[PDB]
Amino acid sequence: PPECPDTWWLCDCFMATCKYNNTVEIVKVECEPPPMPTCSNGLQPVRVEDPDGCCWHWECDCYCTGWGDPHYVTFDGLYYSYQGNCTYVLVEEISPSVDNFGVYIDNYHCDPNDKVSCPRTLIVRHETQEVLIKTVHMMPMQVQVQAVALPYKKYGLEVYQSGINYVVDIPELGVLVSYNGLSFSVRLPYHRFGNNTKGQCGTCTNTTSDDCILPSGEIVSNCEAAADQWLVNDPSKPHCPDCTPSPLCQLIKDSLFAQCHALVPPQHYYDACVFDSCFMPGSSLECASLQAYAALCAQQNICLDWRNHTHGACLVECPSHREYQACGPAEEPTCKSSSSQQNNTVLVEGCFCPEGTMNYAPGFDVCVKTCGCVGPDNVPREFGEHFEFDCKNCVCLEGGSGIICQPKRCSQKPVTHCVEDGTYLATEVNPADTCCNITVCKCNTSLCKEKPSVCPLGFEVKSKMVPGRCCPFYWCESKGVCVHGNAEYQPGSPVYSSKCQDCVCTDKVDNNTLLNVIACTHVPCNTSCSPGFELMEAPGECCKKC
Amino acid sequence: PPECPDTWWLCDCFMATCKYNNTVEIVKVECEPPPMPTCSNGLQPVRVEDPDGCCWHWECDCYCTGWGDPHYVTFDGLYYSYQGNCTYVLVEEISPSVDNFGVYIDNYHCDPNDKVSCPRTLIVRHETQEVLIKTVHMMPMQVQVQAVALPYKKYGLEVYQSGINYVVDIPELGVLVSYNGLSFSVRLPYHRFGNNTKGQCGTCTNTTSDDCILPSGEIVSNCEAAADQWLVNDPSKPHCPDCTPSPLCQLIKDSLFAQCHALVPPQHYYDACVFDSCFMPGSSLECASLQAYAALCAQQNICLDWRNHTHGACLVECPSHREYQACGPAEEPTCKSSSSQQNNTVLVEGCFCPEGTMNYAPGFDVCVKTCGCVGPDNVPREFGEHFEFDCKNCVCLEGGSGIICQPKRCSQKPVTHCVEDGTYLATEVNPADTCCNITVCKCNTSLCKEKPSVCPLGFEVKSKMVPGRCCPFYWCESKGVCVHGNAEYQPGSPVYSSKCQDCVCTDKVDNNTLLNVIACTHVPCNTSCSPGFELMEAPGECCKKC
Ligand SMILES: *[C@@H]1O[C@H](CO[C@@H]2O[C@@H](C)[C@@H](O)[C@@H](O)[C@@H]2O)[C@@H](O[C@@H]2O[C@H](CO)[C@@H](O[C@@H]3O[C@H](CO[C@H]4O[C@H](CO)[C@@H](O)[C@H](O)[C@@H]4O[C@@H]4O[C@H](CO)[C@@H](O[C@@H]5O[C@H](CO)[C@H](O)[C@H](O)[C@H]5O)[C@H](O)[C@H]4NC(C)=O)[C@@H](O)[C@H](O[C@H]4O[C@H](CO)[C@@H](O)[C@H](O)[C@@H]4O[C@@H]4O[C@H](CO)[C@@H](O[C@@H]5O[C@H](CO)[C@H](O)[C@H](O)[C@H]5O)[C@H](O)[C@H]4NC(C)=O)[C@@H]3O)[C@H](O)[C@H]2NC(C)=O)[C@H](O)[C@H]1NC(C)=O
Ligand SMILES: *[C@@H]1O[C@H](CO[C@@H]2O[C@@H](C)[C@@H](O)[C@@H](O)[C@@H]2O)[C@@H](O[C@@H]2O[C@H](CO)[C@@H](O[C@@H]3O[C@H](CO[C@H]4O[C@H](CO)[C@@H](O)[C@H](O)[C@@H]4O[C@@H]4O[C@H](CO)[C@@H](O[C@@H]5O[C@H](CO)[C@H](O)[C@H](O)[C@H]5O)[C@H](O)[C@H]4NC(C)=O)[C@@H](O)[C@H](O[C@H]4O[C@H](CO)[C@@H](O)[C@H](O)[C@@H]4O[C@@H]4O[C@H](CO)[C@@H](O[C@@H]5O[C@H](CO)[C@H](O)[C@H](O)[C@H]5O)[C@H](O)[C@H]4NC(C)=O)[C@@H]3O)[C@H](O)[C@H]2NC(C)=O)[C@H](O)[C@H]1NC(C)=O
Ligand SMILES: *[C@@H]1O[C@H](CO[C@@H]2O[C@@H](C)[C@@H](O)[C@@H](O)[C@@H]2O)[C@@H](O[C@@H]2O[C@H](CO)[C@@H](O[C@@H]3O[C@H](CO[C@H]4O[C@H](CO)[C@@H](O)[C@H](O)[C@@H]4O[C@@H]4O[C@H](CO)[C@@H](O[C@@H]5O[C@H](CO)[C@H](O)[C@H](O)[C@H]5O)[C@H](O)[C@H]4NC(C)=O)[C@@H](O)[C@H](O[C@H]4O[C@H](CO)[C@@H](O)[C@H](O)[C@@H]4O[C@@H]4O[C@H](CO)[C@@H](O[C@@H]5O[C@H](CO)[C@H](O)[C@H](O)[C@H]5O)[C@H](O)[C@H]4NC(C)=O)[C@@H]3O)[C@H](O)[C@H]2NC(C)=O)[C@H](O)[C@H]1NC(C)=O
Ligand SMILES: *[C@@H]1O[C@H](CO)[C@@H](O[C@@H]2O[C@H](CO)[C@@H](O[C@@H]3O[C@H](CO[C@H]4O[C@H](CO)[C@@H](O)[C@H](O)[C@@H]4O[C@@H]4O[C@H](CO)[C@@H](O[C@@H]5O[C@H](CO)[C@H](O)[C@H](O)[C@H]5O)[C@H](O)[C@H]4NC(C)=O)[C@@H](O)[C@H](O[C@H]4O[C@H](CO)[C@@H](O)[C@H](O)[C@@H]4O[C@@H]4O[C@H](CO)[C@@H](O[C@@H]5O[C@H](CO)[C@H](O)[C@H](O)[C@H]5O)[C@H](O)[C@H]4NC(C)=O)[C@@H]3O)[C@H](O)[C@H]2NC(C)=O)[C@H](O)[C@H]1NC(C)=O
Ligand SMILES: *[C@@H]1O[C@H](CO[C@@H]2O[C@@H](C)[C@@H](O)[C@@H](O)[C@@H]2O)[C@@H](O[C@@H]2O[C@H](CO)[C@@H](O[C@@H]3O[C@H](CO)[C@@H](O)[C@H](O)[C@@H]3O)[C@H](O)[C@H]2NC(C)=O)[C@H](O)[C@H]1NC(C)=O
Ligand SMILES: *[C@@H]1O[C@H](CO[C@@H]2O[C@@H](C)[C@@H](O)[C@@H](O)[C@@H]2O)[C@@H](O[C@@H]2O[C@H](CO)[C@@H](O[C@@H]3O[C@H](CO)[C@@H](O)[C@H](O)[C@@H]3O)[C@H](O)[C@H]2NC(C)=O)[C@H](O)[C@H]1NC(C)=O
Ligand SMILES: *[C@@H]1O[C@H](CO)[C@@H](O)[C@H](O)[C@H]1NC(C)=O
Ligand SMILES: *[C@@H]1O[C@H](CO)[C@@H](O)[C@H](O)[C@H]1NC(C)=O
Ligand SMILES: [Ca+2]
Ligand SMILES: [Ca+2]
């Protein structure tokens, strides 16, 4: 046919006006618009491709930032300071395109006035799920509808970490939210969200004039007052109502940030630093705006180290196994699956594993040189290594599931007999293996079956005492004295057996004699008298010289 | 330009002729060849697209199968039976396109005849890696260069399970190797491997005639004789040199397999079944060909349940928490990675978790209903559940890394020994606590001065003895039979304090006679002696009868 049998945008923008099916006037279409001048934000615009492959126009992203306690900068580079306590809406939608979508910021319900214990909580609602990021004295935690871990992904919503920031993103909508504990940033694409947002972050129109509107939809010159009207009522608390310039603030104007003076306007941050320093001196509150300026510069592909120059008073506090770096990868290379990924170009600050080692896997913190397995207890393991974890036999081997554990089945030789009286069979904690639980011939002294063996007065000590046996043996109660003197043999027993017996054995010490000194010196001898005749051996006679 | 400003193949499978730059002579080309009637395999050819998107030809995949001990069928539907005991090569490349690519079957080296646990062993060598798949009585094991786990993936080589088969594949080349313990299968694409393969599986030439070739490279008629010369050399074992047709084989021609009689040639398997039955009756060796026939039918998207009609003698044996299904998904759904639907749409046989439950994750075996966490000890866990795994406080919460564990931080008995002499601090692990040695007082009888109170006499027992303290309390060695007596108050000491006395001591107790049984008896008296008298009670005058 003279007109083409679809005269068409046939391919690769090869457009056409067909004279006939065979002979047509084909056309080719291409173009290139110059880089847009600016976006009332100083940030360089990006390239957005047409639906048609023919061309790409320049459009710049929507960026809202909030730092310090009161400091806000909207999507179009308008800056203002607002103070409040009740939770406030950050960004919402004018015409609902996504169900229950919104970003909110509770600034003081957690900590009113001074936010020293907890500065803010960030609420992100997307359809079914809501995420509340809150901070405490040492490290923030997040609650999803219940607490969760950091590397979270569910229903197109992802939460993770990057440098010193907690990032909540929706890839389908391209929404990025970064929380720091001292500031927050919201990043939105232009085409998806163009002139359809409202809240304290203003309207992403590329115009600074319409950057604040009331919920009704009016325009007010006093942009600070419009922020106070963006209050979200909730069940709890329904009764919502001379300066010497510190040199630190001078760091913005120094030559260190001279590279940042291009591609990023420094007027707002310097004024915020000066105001914070004059609010009260010597509180280390003026090195919070510097962090935001450095973060924005890094986002602008300009990485700088500045904290060195701050003479301390605010640094990073992360554990020993990590070292602080001003320029580092946004996504650290975990050993588990670094694989291949688009290396982005913006190096962010933070603290990472040392140069020699590297992180193990997402959700872990142990840095290792050559990674094998990591169990629930953070201890590095090598491939083909045998270690008794818990009460089991476990092995780290290459493949899936890592650790493989099997039961212990420890056994001991069962002995029931207990020979000594003290020995009594008792199963008890196996000392070597708390799990083996081996039984043992326990020892009770009370169960001593044999009894003390009484001995004669003569013996001294059975020596059985403290034998060290399960049953304590007993020493002999008797002792060495001339016991076997006479009759019932005891220590003196010098009964007068002789007609003139002396034998006064007084336990006189002698070999065997001590035990038995028969010191008998009878004197049965008879001595004459002047008239007592026949006195030789007469009854009861003793020597008598008379 | 009148000459086309590159008359050329226009993009999008179009073409052009050019006598004008815009007014050109446009063309477009395409086709639909009839499906190749057959491919000498009985298998339907697959659609292979050209480089450019213009046309799709019908080339049939290369499939090599071998079941039982001696049976083999080449890539082109040629069948032969070969018996051998040393390792043989299945497929290798005539022109080396991939470094160190090969498949080897080790037959009989591990089990010579009457396989005790390993019928054979597969060796798949690809570049730097080699994989050895071996079997034992109940589960196969794989060694990768040392042992590895089941879900293995490294350097473009992947090893996993599917139904009852172990699958080794290289996604870059499309090579598939399936092992079962009773058979094996090799699947190769045509374009990558055409007229470049050699070995026992033959030439994937699409002609049965050229399938068998000597290692030198000749053509011979008998495939079996050539197969014997495909032997590879290793340091190990370097010295390599009445039939009643059972109804089980008759199941092949039954109406159950009627769908398989088309689209799949059933002659070879039936002949193999008959020959195996004739080899020895009643040994359950004739239900291995049925398995391969059913597997090939299932590969053709035709699932059949047949083991129910075998009247036993060969079924599956997998643990109780899994039930056998003749038609199920090749890749079972696991909660960790539900991701997208499995469009495999071929229902391989095997055994899976029951319909109520679902498998937890790859590399795991526990079937669960609502998945939470699974630690090294295979126990299901719920979200927000607190347990005492190892000696730690651990929690299962949804997110990254699953289980979060922290130290027990066990408290201790604050005691200083104890005041009992003998006590020494033990700081021991109270059975009530676990992993918690706490200070405890350890009375030591060896470490006591029990101050034995030496009693002079008559004290039958001090009675300190054993009262419940570890100190060895003291009994008193003394006893009172004759505490009194001139002889140092010795017991049984009857001596005349006065020569005229008896003081009889029988050592008796009585009432205080235990202290003084001797008491005394007065012998003295004087009576009438010779006239003239004057005896005057002559001193020493004890009772006389003068
Ligand atoms: C950081 O920080 C720091 C501090 O400061 C602070 O901060 C800042 C930021 C600001 O703010 C301020 O203001 C504050 O205060 C700073 O500092 C600086 O540094 C630098 C560097 O370093 C320097 O310069 C240099 O240095 C060197 C050494 O270093 C050292 O020292 C220093 C001082 O001086 C310091 O600072 C540092 O830190 C260091 O320290 C050290 O450390 C070590 C360790 O590591 C140690 O060691 C130790 O000890 C012992 C000994 O050694 C043992 O044995 C061992 O070893 C260990 O243990 C040491 O001791 C320490 N030291 C000290 C003293 O401290 C030096 O040496 C030099 O000297 C030089 O000069 C001369 C003349 O010319 C010559 O003769 C010589 O030879 C030399 O040379 C040189 O070299 C160097 C090095 O390289 C250089 O430096 C550098 O370089 C580079 C290259 O590339 C670049 O250029 C840069 O820029 C630079 O700087 C130089 O330059 C050269 N020179 C020539 C021309 O030659 C010197 O001294 C400075 O001085 C400083 N200052 C201060 C103030 O201090 C920083 O800067 C920061 N950073 C950042 C990042 O920012
Ligand atoms: C040997 O070894 C051992 C150790 O070892 C262990 O154990 C064993 C069994 C096994 O198991 C193994 O294995 C292991 O390892 C030992 O044990 C120990 O001991 C200790 C010492 O002894 C103790 O502590 C303490 O003790 C005391 C005494 O003792 C006793 O007991 C025990 C237990 O507990 C035993 O064991 C022993 O043997 C003894 O026994 C007894 O004894 C008693 C005394 O003699 C007797 O009694 C008698 O009789 C009658 C009654 O019956 C009468 O009446 C009187 O009483 C007496 O005469 C008994 O009979 C027996 N039994 C048997 C069975 O034998 C104790 O006493 C103590 O306790 C107490 O105190 C406390 C304080 O605090 C309290 O609380 C409590 O309650 C009590 O009190 C009273 O007491 C009494 C007496 O005893 C009673 O009665 C009786 O008891 C018994 C016990 O057994 C039984 O029950 C009977 O039935 C009943 O009747 C009451 O009841 C009570 N109550 C009240 C009223 O209060 C403490 O106990 C420990 O404990 C132990 N442990 C164990 C576990 O056992 C052993 O000893 C050895 N042995 C030998 C011989 O050596
Ligand atoms: C209580 O307390 C007590 C005290 O008290 C006392 O005593 C008593 C009995 C009573 O009498 C009371 O009265 C008095 O007071 C105590 O005990 C003690 O202990 C301590 C500690 O242990 C000791 O120390 C030691 O020493 C030594 C010397 O000496 C010794 O020896 C001798 C002979 O020679 C003898 O005689 C003595 O006795 C002694 O012995 C001893 O003993 C103990 C007790 O028993 C013992 O302990 C214990 O034991 C048990 C059983 O029974 C078990 O065995 C346990 O385990 C243990 O612990 C000891 O052992 C023993 N020893 C001996 C020798 O015998 C020295 O020598 C020593 O040193 C050593 O040892 C140590 C540990 O112990 C160590 O550490 C060191 O190093 C050393 O080493 C040694 O070396 C030696 C030489 O060579 C040896 O020997 C020999 O060896 C061989 C091989 O080579 C073989 O075995 C043979 O058999 C052997 O003999 C050894 O063995 C080694 N050892 C080791 C392990 O190493 C120490 O220093 C003391 O002495 C004691 N004392 C007594 C007398 O006894 C307790 O203990 C307490 N507790 C409770 C019971 O409660
Ligand atoms: C792998 O193994 C498979 C199983 O063996 C095999 O599948 C089929 O195998 C059959 C048996 O081998 C095979 O049958 C053919 O038989 C021919 C001899 O008899 C035929 O020719 C005489 C006249 O010479 C004729 O009287 C008689 O009736 C037969 O007619 C033939 O019928 C064929 C089947 O319909 C037909 O092939 C079909 O062509 C279709 C075209 O749209 C379509 O592609 C179908 O898919 C295809 O099957 C064939 O064209 C026709 N011939 C004529 C002239 O009537 C053999 O000659 C023939 O071998 C040739 O074909 C196979 C592929 O089929 C080639 O591999 C092989 O190299 C031969 O190449 C052929 O060469 C002849 C001579 O030059 C060509 O004849 C010309 O045809 C022109 C029109 O197309 C024109 O008339 C010219 O004047 C003729 O000279 C012929 O076209 C060439 N074919 C091709 C495609 O190369 C074959 O053995 C059957 O064809 C096989 N079908 C397929 C594709 O599966 C499979 O082929 C094997 N594959 C490979 C890679 O080897
Ligand atoms: C990203 O991609 C690579 C670097 O790889 C990146 O960082 C790794 C640590 C991993 O995280 C990766 O997942 C991640 O993508 C770089 O692109 C270019 O790579 C080649 C090496 O393949 C560099 O060498 C160049 O090319 C050849 C050598 O292959 C030679 O001509 C020269 O050696 C030449 O230098 C190349 O330099 C590098 N690109 C640059 C900087 O020119 C790069 O870091 C980055 N590229 C992107 C994202 O475009
Ligand atoms: C034997 O002794 C017991 C007391 O127990 C003993 O006391 C010393 C002799 C010790 O050396 C040990 O041998 C032993 O511990 C007498 O039992 C009782 O004694 C008391 C005190 O004398 C009597 O009380 C008296 O009773 C009299 C009247 O009988 C009164 O006149 C006194 O004023 C006083 O109340 C008590 O009655 C008595 N009871 C008994 C059991 O008789 C025991 O009498 C005595 N027997 C002998 C052999 O004399
Ligand atoms: C294509 O165009 C030529 C020139 O007009 C004409 O002669 C021919 O018939 C056309 N063919 C078709 C299919 O329109
Ligand atoms: C170029 O295109 C025009 C319009 O179709 C045609 O008239 C002319 O002949 C073409 N050839 C030349 C001169 O490039
Ligand atoms: Ca605006
Ligand atoms: Ca062939």
Structural description of this entry:
Two copies of one chain form a homodimer. The first copy, chain A, is mainly beta and 546 residues long. The first copy, chain A, folds into seven domains: 30 residues, no CATH class; 28 residues, no CATH class; 179 residues, 3-Layer(aba) Sandwich (Protein Transport Mog1p, Chain A), CATH 3.40.1000; 73 residues, no CATH class; 84 residues, no CATH class; 70 residues, no CATH class; 67 residues, no CATH class. The first copy, chain A, is 6% helix and 22% strand. Chain A contains four helices and 29 strands. In chain A, the strands form nine sheets. Chain A has an eight-stranded antiparallel β-sheet, with no helix packed on it. A six-stranded antiparallel β-sheet of chain A has the order 12-11-10-9-8-18, with no helix packed on it. A three-stranded antiparallel β-sheet of chain A has the order 25-26-27, with no helix packed on it. In chain A, β6 and β7 form a beta hairpin. The longest helix of chain A has 13 residues. The first copy, chain A, is elongated, with a radius of gyration of 50 Å. The N and C termini of chain A lie far apart (187 Å). The interface between A and B is large, with 60 and 59 residues. β2 of chain A pairs antiparallel with β2 of chain B. Bound molecules: a molecule of 10 linked components (NAG-NAG-BMA-MAN-NAG-GAL-MAN-NAG-...) (3 copies), a molecule of 9 linked components (NAG-NAG-BMA-MAN-NAG-GAL-MAN-NAG-...), a molecule of 4 linked components (NAG-NAG-BMA-FUC) (2 copies), 2-acetamido-2-deoxy-beta-D-glucopyranose (2 copies) and calcium ion (2 copies). Chains A, B: It comes from Homo sapiens (Human). Chains A, B: This is Mucin-2.
